[PDB]
RNA sequence: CUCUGCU
RNA sequence: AGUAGUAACAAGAG
């Protein structure tokens, strides 16, 4: 009697039990050590798929560049980056013809976005490469460093607050003959200044930082991802904005819509294909990813698509949209941390930075790394490898799906000019293509035509992990369609458990996750009760907030027991204070504070909901009652939760490991910046709720506001003559401090 | 400790299945040291909770 | 002897 | 030793 869970599929169809095929209960495979090997492998692989292209040497950066555009046509089914300019232009032209005015309307919408977009938009996003520090920094921090460097270099055209002005400053910076930056060296703190030549700054402005994608499920081997610099992101935002505007106007483009919007759009489109197909016509659906999609999406083709899309538009708009593909076509990839060398005989470790691989001897490496270094050495320049071809983890997902949907629209009977035709859905590298043809031979001919056309445009379908079946069931971006999308709960299992925001936000998020899974992922009511019980147990263990009546011993047990004895109405206690769990299927949508409000003791209610408690801290409105959640698959998600701000809405300790590094000064600067901003809010309460405006320094605004507030308070009598006198004298002293400096 | 006080059949430990790449005497000494530690804890009146 | 446990 | 797997931990920086 050998039990075999897989045999369950003999009765339950695979899709209906697809959740069993997801091991997401276990830990995801993480990456150990450096990502330099993965970056080198990616660069070599990208240059291998385009080897038959043209080799040139950039005249500005001096690095070799490879152009596969209009290269020899593919002669084999392997991935190939030889995209044809004529074919891509033809695909875009036919997309325009089939969807008249799409490019024009999208261009105008992008025009208004470009007009009304501010520099602060670049603050969104995470782990942005900071060229000034040669490391990844938070997007806001990298933006601030770049702005400060530009100001110190005379690029004082960004104070207008418009992103386009910042882009103008970016170009002016690249055109400068020299640059000055500020770096800290400790040997004692030294605020040294470094001078960068034109070529070095150019190389470090096109540089693309690389790391290893961690916690990635479904892949045995780890892969390297990349994040761009501050200069690139500005133009990338506009490019993406235009591509997303175009995508929203395409029925086959489901990328911009997400979640249940994505599922509904895909369901409607597949239903339309099943409907408009002739009854007598044989219908098939292909499921597949595109092999080496990111490695083959050349940026020159993106430049061609942008130039075609921006036809007849104002020349400045064409420039703003086309700059990003230009820069990416001349991009560079940082290698990363480097490698680690060990000596067993002498029993010692060492880390060799990736910048010194262009000269280190090859005897220190194993065979695989030996050949990767040998192959990538020609492209190494100033610690970075030239990666002109391909798109290393490109952010042009929107543009790439525009190209895919253009090729997908090429399958209309007015374009195929044959009995067979095709349509489907495209999203980044994933696609689900439906072929209708009178007979199986027609289906095969249509499949071959689509595959060959994709090869022409540079899209390489992955024959390895793609398959065709009769229309009705398919898969698309981890969404399994079986005559209708089926719920796959295993995807949302990692979201369960303690989120780790705070006691209140984590209770609210847990109950909201259970409720959302009931609504969307077919979480039954009994299983919902199970999930609630398990989440409460995990929450109590994590937060050491077991019920006071329990004998469990923990460093927080004494206080909870004292509170339990103190309270008269036990039911009113929150779970974070040893109170019982009153949640159920009925009230998963009610915050615990409001759920237990009537049961709370008056004094306990006041203490818990005291607005003057020091635990609660409020940042800008954009970071209130919301959290960032990372699903098993997909990008970061902004989850909003309903929670009453109580003493439990505290902040966890901040990682202090930067205190014993040469770059502590940034932390100090952050502290001071906060010290200033919080005072500005003390003078302008609405600064947090909505961003303030003005050109004057903070000191001028604060002192003027203080003076006027003093006069109004005096007139209303809220302050006496002496208080007004002291306020005025302090303001005059502040003025004198500003003047003297 | 109480659970160990429930079985009265222990005896001098001996290596029956060696660890090919390990140092078996080290494992035997580790077990003996753990037994000694828990015995010292038992006969001791102090209350070490995280021995 | 001090600092750090995602920097 | 062992974890682990294409590169690392088996403390690191002063």
Structural notes for this entry:
This is part of a larger assembly, with chains A (741 residues) and B (51 residues). Chain A is of the alpha+beta class and 741 residues long. Helices cover 42% and strands 14% of the residues of chain A. The radius of gyration of chain A is 30 Å and the shape is globular. By secondary structure, chain B is mainly alpha-helical. Helices cover 39% and strands 0% of the residues of chain B. The longest helix of chain B is centred in the middle third of the chain and has 20 residues, at 24-43. The chains hardly touch. Chain A binds a RNA duplex (7 and 14 nucleotides) through helix 1. Chain A: Influenza RNA polymerase is composed of three subunits: PB1, PB2 and PA. Interacts (via N-terminus) with PA (via C-terminus). Interacts (via C-terminus) with PB2 (via N-terminus); this interaction is essential for transcription initiation.
* Helix share bin of chain B: 25-40%
In N-to-C order, the SSE pattern of chain B is H
Distance between the termini of chain B: 12 Å
Major β-sheet annotation of chain A: 5 strands, mixed
Largest beta sheet of chain B, briefly?
none
**Structural class designation of chain A:** alpha+beta
Shape, per Cα inertia axes of chain A: globular
Structural class of chain B: mainly alpha
Number of helices of chain A: 24
Percentage of β-strand residues of chain A? 5-15%
What's the number of extended β-strand segments of chain B?
Answer: 0
Q: What oligomerization state is this entry in?
A: part of a larger assembly
Distance between the termini of chain A: 87 Å
Organism (chain B): Influenza A virus (A/Zhejiang/DTID-ZJU01/2013(H7N9))
Family (chain B): Belongs to the influenza viruses PA family.
Subunit structure (chain B): Influenza RNA polymerase is composed of three subunits: PB1, PB2 and PA. Interacts (via C-terminus) with PB1 (via N-terminus).
Protein name (chain B): Polymerase acidic protein
